Amino acid sequence: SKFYKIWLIFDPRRVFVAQGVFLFLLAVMIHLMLLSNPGFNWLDISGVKYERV
Amino acid sequence: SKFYKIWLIFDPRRVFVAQGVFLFLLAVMIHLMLLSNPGFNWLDISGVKYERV
Amino acid sequence: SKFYKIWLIFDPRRVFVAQGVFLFLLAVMIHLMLLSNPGFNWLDISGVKYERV
Amino acid sequence: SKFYKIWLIFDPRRVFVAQGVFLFLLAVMIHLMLLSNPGFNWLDISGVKYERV
Amino acid sequence: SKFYKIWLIFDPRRVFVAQGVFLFLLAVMIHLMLLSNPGFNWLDISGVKYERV
Amino acid sequence: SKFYKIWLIFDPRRVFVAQGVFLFLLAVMIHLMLLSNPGFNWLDISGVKYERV
Amino acid sequence: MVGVNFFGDFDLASLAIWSFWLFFALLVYYLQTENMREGYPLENEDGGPAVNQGPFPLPSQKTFKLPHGRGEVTVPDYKKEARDVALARTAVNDGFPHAPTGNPMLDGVGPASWAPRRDIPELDGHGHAKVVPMSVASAFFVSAGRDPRGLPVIANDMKTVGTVTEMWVDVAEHMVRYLEVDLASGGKCLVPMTMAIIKKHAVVVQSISSAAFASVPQTKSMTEISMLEEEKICAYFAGGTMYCADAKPK
Amino acid sequence: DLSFTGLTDQQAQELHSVYLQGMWLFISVAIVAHLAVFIWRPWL
Amino acid sequence: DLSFTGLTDQQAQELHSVYLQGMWLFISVAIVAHLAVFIWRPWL
Amino acid sequence: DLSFTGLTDQQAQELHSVYLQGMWLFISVAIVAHLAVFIWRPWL
Amino acid sequence: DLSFTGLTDQQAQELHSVYLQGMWLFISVAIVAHLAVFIWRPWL
Amino acid sequence: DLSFTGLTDQQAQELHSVYLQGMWLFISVAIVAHLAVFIWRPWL
Amino acid sequence: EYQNIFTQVQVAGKPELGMVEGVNLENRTTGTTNWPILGWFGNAQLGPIYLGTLGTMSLIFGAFWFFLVGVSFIIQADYSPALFLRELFRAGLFPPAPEYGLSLSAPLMEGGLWLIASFFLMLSVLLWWARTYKRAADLGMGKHTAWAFAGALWLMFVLSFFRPILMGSWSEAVPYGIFPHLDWTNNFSLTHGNLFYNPFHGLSIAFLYGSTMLFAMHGATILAVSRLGGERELEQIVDRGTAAERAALFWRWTMGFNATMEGIHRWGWWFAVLTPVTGGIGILLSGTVVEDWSVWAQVHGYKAL
Amino acid sequence: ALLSFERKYRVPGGTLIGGNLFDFWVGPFYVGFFGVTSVFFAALGTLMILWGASLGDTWNPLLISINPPPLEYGLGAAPLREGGIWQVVTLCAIGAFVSWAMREVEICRKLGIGLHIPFAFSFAIFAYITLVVIRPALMGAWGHGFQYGVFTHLEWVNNVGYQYGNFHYNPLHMLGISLFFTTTLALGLHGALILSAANPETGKEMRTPDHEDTFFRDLVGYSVGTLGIHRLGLLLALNAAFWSAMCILASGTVWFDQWVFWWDWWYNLPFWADL
Numbered sequence A, B, C, D, E, F: 001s002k003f004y005k006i007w008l009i010f011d012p013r014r015v016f017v018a019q020g021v022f023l024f025l026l027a028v029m030i031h032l033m034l035l036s037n038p039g040f041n042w043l044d045i046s047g048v049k050y051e052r053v
Numbered sequence G: 001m002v003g004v005n006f007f008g009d010f011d012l013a014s015l016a017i018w019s020f021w022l023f024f025a026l027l028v029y030y031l032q033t034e035n036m037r038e039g040y041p042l043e044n045e046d047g048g049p050a051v052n053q054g055p056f057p058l059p060s061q062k063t064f065k066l067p068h069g070r071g072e073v074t075v076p077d078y079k080k081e082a083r084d085v086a087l088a089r090t091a092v093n094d095g096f097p098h099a100p101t102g103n104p105m106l107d108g109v110g111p112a113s114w115a116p117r118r119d120i121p122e123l124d125g126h127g128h129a130k131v132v133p134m135s136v137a138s139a140f141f142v143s144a145g146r147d148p149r150g151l152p153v154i155a156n157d158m159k160t161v162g163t164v165t166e167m168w169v170d171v172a173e174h175m176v177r178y179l180e181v182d183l184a185s186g187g188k189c190l191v192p193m194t195m196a197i198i199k200k201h202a203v204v205v206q207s208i209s210s211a212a213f214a215s216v217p218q219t220k221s222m223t224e225i226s227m228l229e230e231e232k233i234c235a236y237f238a239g240g241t242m243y244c245a246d247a248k249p250k
Numbered sequence H, I, J, K, L: 001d002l003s004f005t006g007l008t009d010q011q012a013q014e015l016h017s018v019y020l021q022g023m024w025l026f027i028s029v030a031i032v033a034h035l036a037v038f039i040w041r042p043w044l
Numbered sequence M: 001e002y003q004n005i006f007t008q009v010q011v012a013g014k015p016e017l018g019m020v021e022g023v024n025l026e027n028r029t030t031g032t033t034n035w036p037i038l039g040w041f042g043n044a045q046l047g048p049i050y051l052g053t054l055g056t057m058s059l060i061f062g063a064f065w066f067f068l069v070g071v072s073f074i075i076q077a078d079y080s081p082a083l084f085l086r087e088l089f090r091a092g093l094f095p096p097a098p099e100y101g102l103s104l105s106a107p108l109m110e111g112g113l114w115l116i117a118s119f120f121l122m123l124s125v126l127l128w129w130a131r132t133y134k135r136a137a138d139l140g141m142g143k144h145t146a147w148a149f150a151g152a153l154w155l156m157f158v159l160s161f162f163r164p165i166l167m168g169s170w171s172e173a174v175p176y177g178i179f180p181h182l183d184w185t186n187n188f189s190l191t192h193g194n195l196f197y198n199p200f201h202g203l204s205i206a207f208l209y210g211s212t213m214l215f216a217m218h219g220a221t222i223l224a225v226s227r228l229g230g231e232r233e234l235e236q237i238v239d240r241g242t243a244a245e246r247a248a249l250f251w252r253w254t255m256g257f258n259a260t261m262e263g264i265h266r267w268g269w270w271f272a273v274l275t276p277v278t279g280g281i282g283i284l285l286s287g288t289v290v291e292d293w294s295v296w297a298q299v300h301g302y303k304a305l
Numbered sequence N: 001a002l003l004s005f006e007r008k009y010r011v012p013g014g015t016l017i018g019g020n021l022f023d024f025w026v027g028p029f030y031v032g033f034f035g036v037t038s039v040f041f042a043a044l045g046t047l048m049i050l051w052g053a054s055l056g057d058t059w060n061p062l063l064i065s066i067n068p069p070p071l072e073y074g075l076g077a078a079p080l081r082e083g084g085i086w087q088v089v090t091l092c093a094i095g096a097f098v099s100w101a102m103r104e105v106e107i108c109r110k111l112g113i114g115l116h117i118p119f120a121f122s123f124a125i126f127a128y129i130t131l132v133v134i135r136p137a138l139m140g141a142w143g144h145g146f147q148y149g150v151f152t153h154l155e156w157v158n159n160v161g162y163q164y165g166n167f168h169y170n171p172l173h174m175l176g177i178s179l180f181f182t183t184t185l186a187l188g189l190h191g192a193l194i195l196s197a198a199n200p201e202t203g204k205e206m207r208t209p210d211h212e213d214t215f216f217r218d219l220v221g222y223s224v225g226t227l228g229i230h231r232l233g234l235l236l237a238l239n240a241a242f243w244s245a246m247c248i249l250a251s252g253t254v255w256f257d258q259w260v261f262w263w264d265w266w267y268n269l270p271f272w273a274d275l
């Protein structure tokens, strides 16, 4: 409920910077897993769906 | 009990950092272990289930 | 018995952190050793039990 | 058998940590030598005793 | 006869630690030598003796 | 004759430690030399003597 | 990108290597010009500007801020050396040695040359004098090796000039830097630890004669030493390595 | 007053509020994206 | 009062309460996830 | 120096008590886990 | 009372006593374990 | 009583006594073990 | 003459705990020990260390990577402590086989554990990089150390991250054994023709040799001018003395040009940094652009025939 | 053209052989007796390299190669077109390298400073002489020296490396590689630390040598110190040179199989021999 007091413990600037870099790397990592798998590579799936688009 | 005395011993910042680190490590390792096994690899499981999905 | 006096000799910070690390690493080792055995690999066992779950 | 005088000389912290590390290593080595032997490997033995447990 | 005076020369900590490490290493050496030789390897001896135990 | 003068020249602790280490290395080396030769390996000799002890 | 080439056999690999050569020529230019912040412009052998100055032009001025209120330093400074040098050329052409016009060691020329540094002590990170006698440091003690204090000091001719009475240490980097010698001449003397060998019986200084010890550059104070005094003392010993070498045995 | 950061108990109110707004925006967008992906190509 | 950390006991009360609230939320979500995964593919 | 750690007699008590309860909870959960695993696949 | 660690005689006494209880527990459990293992699979 | 270790005379005798007792116990147990092992599998 | 190779007499005062210039002191340990066997060569103080968030996280991730490599060794030794010790240099944790491509679906003992360990190794080196940056930032120093470390990290990441992705297979990353990664290096040269005919491998070697030669030269120079206040390199940058002058005149008279006290360290920085920077470029081009550096050299006129 | 502080150091003295006969400068370069010999040796070696190139079929400076005599000439002097040019260049190279070091000695004596630089360069010279003299003499043929060419001496490195299987499994080679890698790392760290102290963050005063002690103590827990880093870099590089020379000297003289089989002493220790 009263989770706001984290800002009394951790510095907002550093937690925002770390959160941003963490989220970016996580997003890139998941997209690259999906492109790795030939069941979720969306470029090739779309190529086959429309018969080479 | 009255476990709160732990925060009298350890600085909360170090505890929070360590605990987040170990939770992240644990989650990454479990997910990768499941992906390595071909009975719990959900991407490939779905690919088989939905006839290429 | 009267084990409590050890906390007058050993720093609780060091002891607690060391026990935490040691127990975590021991548990990881035991689980990985069990997964390597193809008689206690519970993921594969469940795969067999339910006919590919 | 008034051996308590050893604590007058030896640091209890140092001797306790050394004993603990040495005992853990000893137990691990004995267990691993037993697991290595296919006559005392209890994971593979139970597999045969219960017809693949 | 009166070998006690040596504790005035040699510091007891260094002697006791060196001697403990010494005896441990010597015992480990002898056990490994017996285990290395396949005529005093007691694990395989028992395996043969009790029909694979 | 009057050799005790050397104990006024060479420190008993250093000399005794070197002597102990040297004698141990010598005895170990001689024993391993004997064990290497398949003519004086007493374990194998006992094995042959008692028809596999 | 295998086998696919620009320009008819010019590759992404060819492109990369040519790109590197271009970058490396630029980096060599940068490195050379960075290394021209001392000693330029080139002079002629009479103190005037040289006719040739080299293919590389001088870099732009750069400033250092100095801690503990010791101003700023901009380089290249374009200034000429701030000391007179008692030499005289031995030939009207160029490329030949200039000969000392008096005593090379007392004048401070050749291997005895000193640079005109500031007449203030070098400081540690806390603003205190960096090199001091152990009578001042007072928490320093000999930790290993043999203490030279009280030993006789022997010059490069086998004659003893006095005894070691004090060590001067660097309080920032825990090191001995000078030995203070009490001289039978009548006064005191600092000897660089880099120029002394400590042995069981004596400290031997194989760069300076016994007559040279009578005239070692002095310090204003016996509790601190300026960088100028340091230059003069160390230069005196290093120059003795040439101008005292005939006093050696045989 | 407890402050490992020097901030005020109220300054944590405003920072927390704005951080929650940004958080909820990001998560709502991610939720809609996951719904769309799951319709387009289900993974469970 | 002893303070390795500079924390007063009343600050420890609140900090521990909030920590427990967060931990319980995390564990409850993980429990729901495990029930769902067990229904989807049981592993024992 | 009786107190190598800055702890006193009584706060050493309280720390030991909470440590011992935590250890007991860990061990009891481990015992139950081992019983369940032994029923599921006995290794002895 | 000479002591390389500074612990007096009496703390040595109580520390030695508690050390003995711990040591006897460890050895007695190990004895029971070795008996059980020898029954299960003898090794000599 | 010149002493490098710093111990005066009284520690020497009791130290030696307990040391010798432990020594003799160790060799006695080793002798019993060697007799048992020799009976089990003679090596000479 | 005293060669300043070993200290003659060591001295010690109060231990030095560091400069305070914006460092969080509560993250700096307080215990120093003074070890005189090191004081013969360098400093004797085993000083405090700084331990903050980045260092703790980096150590945790790296230690876990190390642990996971060890556990794999134990398992492939078939649990034997004897094989484990006999094969401590010959065993490796190997990447997945080629058939698994870049997918994350390879058995745990056939590349999966390699992937998990590799992830945590990646995390720790990047956190250590951030540490090298932030320790400089907290003292108010320039960022040269972090940039230099970034160059070495670039070679590391082309080795196991960038190039295997561009080749489409984890199987081309380097395994985690002492002898098997040397085997990997040998195999890599053997499969791409001959890596001697890789121009960036040649340039990397030139910068390795040059950085070794340069620091022979620079250490010898500073030692030779130590009679003057030579090794106090800082404060000779801002107040030139005879040590800097004589060091410059030695090399000017010897080879016709010289450096300055500040600028020799730029040469060394660039020679050291260019070794992994240029090396990474040459590995990245191998397989991706050039398959056989021998025939490429023949076509580009520096291998005969 | 003299540097603005150079004049006071241009004094007579410091020579070893010919007194004031050669005690003069040519531009920046000090000459001395060994400058005359080093110039002559370098010019003659370069000019025989060019003459040997003329006798081949390429003027491409990356394909020119002067080859040692065939093995059948042993340690004899070969006909000048059948390995003799290589021997002439090798003798010229030794003459120039040694003359260069002796010239460095004279410059150190004139600017009264230590002789560490010629000493270190002599370690480099020893590695070269091991490569072309010591090892081929023990093997009994000059033709075991390496051919002189920008890319053909790499063919020598390749052939000799693969004679003993994979050359990585050479313990002295391992030691030498570690010293080369470590000296490069140390150069990187030392240059970076100096530059960081001299070039702070914008607007800050220049850092002290205390700050750089503090930087490494914070980063790794240890600081070797200003004097220590130079001693360390010097000895690291010298050991890399020496152990590389020992590496190559051992191969073909005292060891002849694939270097991988050397570790069979550890792998065939009798207790785990058969496992």
Ligand code: BCL
Binding pocket: M125, M152, M153, M155, M156, M159, M184, M185, M186, M187, M188, M189, M190, M194, M195, M196, M200, M201, M204, M205, M206, M208, M275, M276, M278, M279, M280, M282, M283, N157, N181
């Ligand atoms: C048969 C073998 C092949 C061969 C195959 C290869 C291959 C393959 C590679 C090289 C590479 C290199 N080769 Mg080779 N090479 C051969 C012959 C040679 C010869 C010779 C005399 O014959 C020489 C001198 C060299 C020299 C070199 C180097 C110049 C270069 C590596 C540069 C570098 O920075 O490395 C040292 C730096 C690193 C390895 C960077 C990574 C280190 C990281 C930063 C460490 C961080 C910390 C770590 C994770 C954890 C532990 C720390 C804890 C404290 C415990 N090669 C032959 C032809 N060579 C590399 C290169 O760049 O090629 C272009 C490379 O990948």
Ligand code: BCL
Binding pocket: M185, N097, N124, N125, N127, N128, N130, N131, N156, N157, N158, N159, N160, N161, N162, N166, N167, N168, N173, N176, N177, N180, N241, N243, N244, N245, N246, N247, N248
């Ligand atoms: C198939 C190839 C084999 C192999 C086979 C060999 C062989 C064979 C040898 C080495 C040697 C070495 N190898 Mg290996 N090596 C391999 C892979 C590697 C790898 C790697 C990452 O894979 C590395 C880092 C190394 C590293 C090294 C070094 C330890 C060493 C080279 C340095 C040296 O000798 O300096 C010594 C420096 C010199 C000889 C330079 C001398 C310079 C002289 C004094 C001055 C010249 C001036 C010049 C003419 C002037 C021009 C004028 C201009 C004005 C400038 N090797 C593979 C496995 N390696 C060599 C060695 O140890 O040699 C001693 C060697 O012989």
Ligand SMILES: CC[C@H]1c2cc3[nH]c4c(c3C)C(=O)[C@H](C(=O)OC)c4c3nc(cc4[nH]c(cc(n2)[C@@H]1C)c(C(C)=O)c4C)[C@@H](C)[C@@H]3CCC(=O)OC/C=C(\C)CCC[C@H](C)CCC[C@H](C)CCCC(C)C
Binding pocket: C025, M058, M059, M061, M062, M063, M064, M066, M067, M070, M124, M125, M128, M132, M145, M146, M148, M149, M151, M152, M272, M273, M274, M275, M276, N181, N182, N184, N185, N188, N189, N192, N219, N220
């Ligand atoms: C310019 C290029 C050169 C260079 C540069 C360079 N390297 C650098 C730097 C720079 C400028 C740094 O700032 C950085 C540094 O901090 O140096 C002191 C670093 C450094 N370069 C290093 C190594 C290194 N550099 C190399 C190469 C080079 N680095 C190039 C030649 C090599 C080679 C040649 O292979 C190596 C091996 C490190 C000393 C350091 C980077 C520190 C680092 O990466 O930390 C990450 C941490 C880990 C992986 C943690 C490991 C933890 C231990 C294994 C724990 C042990 C615990 C216990 C024993 C038990 C363990 C198991 C389980 C039970 C836990």
Ligand SMILES: CCCCCCCCCCCCCCCCCC(=O)OC[C@H](COP(=O)(O)OCCN)OC(=O)CCCCCCCCCCCCCCCCC
Binding pocket: G028, G032, G053, G054, G055, G056, G057, M202, M203, M206, M207, M210, M255, M256, M257, M258, N046
């Ligand atoms: C027969 C063929 C002859 C050549 C073929 C040999 C191969 C050459 C390859 C390396 C080049 C080495 C040649 C070095 C030249 C030596 C002469 C010299 O440098 O002095 C002349 C010049 C004048 O000095 P100065 O007046 O003080 O300059 C500042 C004033 N404006 O001083 C200067 O120019 C100052 C500039 C310094 C030059 C920087 C040196 C760069 C060396 C880095 C190389 C490392 C990478 C090499 C890669 C090798 C790959 C194979």
Ligand SMILES: CCCCCCCCCCCCCCCCCC(=O)OC[C@H](COP(=O)(O)OCCN)OC(=O)CCCCCCCCCCCCCCCCC
Binding pocket: G019, G020, G022, G023, G024, G026, G027, G030, M141, M142, M143, M144, M147, M148, M150, M151, M154, M273, M277, M281, N195, N199, N200, N201
């Ligand atoms: C056809 C196109 C081909 C390319 C040709 C064009 C290239 C032109 C670029 C100029 C050539 C180099 C000459 C100038 C660069 C030298 C650096 C410099 O100018 O000064 C150094 C400067 C820092 O200034 P400083 O006084 O030191 O103060 C900083 C205080 N913190 O700044 C620096 O210190 C620079 C520090 C960063 C330098 C690199 C660090 C490496 C980091 C990781 C490298 C990994 C990336 C690998 C890239 C490979 C891509 C395939």
Ligand SMILES: COC(C)(C)C/C=C/C(C)=C/C=C/C(C)=C/C=C/C(C)=C/C=C/C=C(C)/C=C/C=C(/C)CC/C=C(/C)CCC=C(C)C
Binding pocket: C003, C006, C010, D016, D019, D026, D029, D030, D033, D034, E024, E027, E028, E031, E032, E035, K019, K022, K023, K024, K025, K026, K027
């Ligand atoms: C297959 O094996 C092959 C390896 C046979 C060959 C092996 C040969 C071997 C293994 C020879 C080994 C000989 C040895 C060294 C035997 C052991 C000697 C020792 C040191 C035994 C010690 C036993 C137990 C002790 C000291 C008690 C342990 C447990 C306790 C609870 C008391 C101390 C520890 C704690 C945690 C309590 C006090 C501390 C606190 C903080 C309360």
Ligand SMILES: COC(C)(C)C/C=C/C(C)=C/C=C/C(C)=C/C=C/C(C)=C/C=C/C=C(C)/C=C/C=C(\C)CC/C=C(\C)CCC=C(C)C
Binding pocket: A016, A023, A026, A029, A030, A033, B024, B027, B028, B031, B032, H018, H019, H020, H021, H022, H023, H024, H026, M104, M119
């Ligand atoms: C994927 O790779 C591999 C295959 C390695 C194996 C692992 C797979 C998995 C599942 C790994 C585990 C992934 C994790 C850690 C999932 C958990 C993710 C979390 C915790 C996501 C949280 C996201 C975002 C939060 C909590 C908040 C976001 C807030 C914003 C975006 C708003 C920020 C902007 C603001 C506040 C504007 C105002 C700014 C100022 C300075 C006032």
Ligand SMILES: COC(C)(C)C/C=C/C(C)=C/C=C/C(C)=C/C=C/C(C)=C/C=C/C=C(C)/C=C\C=C(\C)CC/C=C(\C)CCC=C(C)C
Binding pocket: A002, A003, A004, A005, A006, A009, B023, B026, B029, B030, C024, C027, C028, C031, C032, I014, I015, I018, I019, I020, I021, I022, I023, I026
């Ligand atoms: C079979 O393979 C096995 C190998 C998978 C791999 C691993 C096996 C092992 C070792 C598994 C078990 C590992 C362990 C030890 C798990 C225990 C995990 C714990 C302790 C989870 C607890 C989490 C508690 C959290 C995350 C606390 C809070 C949650 C939040 C979202 C933060 C809220 C807290 C606040 C806001 C307090 C901040 C303070 C103030 C004043 C606001």
Ligand SMILES: COC(C)(C)C/C=C/C(C)=C/C=C/C(C)=C/C=C/C(C)=C/C=C/C=C(C)\C=C/C=C(/C)CC/C=C(/C)CCC=C(C)C
Binding pocket: A029, M066, M067, M069, M070, M071, M073, M115, M116, M118, M119, M120, M121, M122, M156, M157, M158, M159, M160, M161, M173, M174, M175, M176, M177, M178, M181
């Ligand atoms: C008693 O306890 C233990 C078990 C300690 C016994 C331990 C034994 C040990 C620790 C043995 C360890 C041995 C060795 C040989 C360690 C060193 C191995 C070597 C030679 C490592 C060299 C590696 C070179 C490189 C280039 C490594 C990594 C490069 C990267 C770019 C890492 C990132 C790569 C990937 C694929 C990250 C993956 C990310 C995802 C999301 C899958």
Ligand SMILES: COC(C)(C)C/C=C/C(C)=C/C=C/C(C)=C/C=C/C(C)=C/C=C/C=C(C)\C=C/C=C(\C)CC/C=C(\C)CCC=C(C)C
Binding pocket: B003, B006, C016, C019, C029, C030, C031, C033, C034, D024, D027, D028, D031, D035, D043, J018, J019, J020, J021, J022, J023, J026
């Ligand atoms: C199964 O596969 C392979 C694994 C077959 C075979 C492996 C065989 C091996 C390696 C066998 C031998 C393993 C060994 C040597 C195991 C030793 C285990 C030990 C030493 C266990 C001792 C544990 C001691 C304690 C005190 C454990 C837990 C205590 C706590 C968790 C205290 C909790 C209280 C805390 C953290 C205070 C605050 C309270 C809370 C609730 C946070």
Ligand SMILES: [Fe+3]
Binding pocket: M218, M222, M233, M265, N190, N194
């Ligand atoms: Fe330097």
